Amino acid sequence: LAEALHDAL
């Protein structure tokens, strides 16, 4: 999750 969001943002 943390990484996925880091990228999406």
Ligand SMILES: [Co+2]
């Ligand atoms: Co990434």
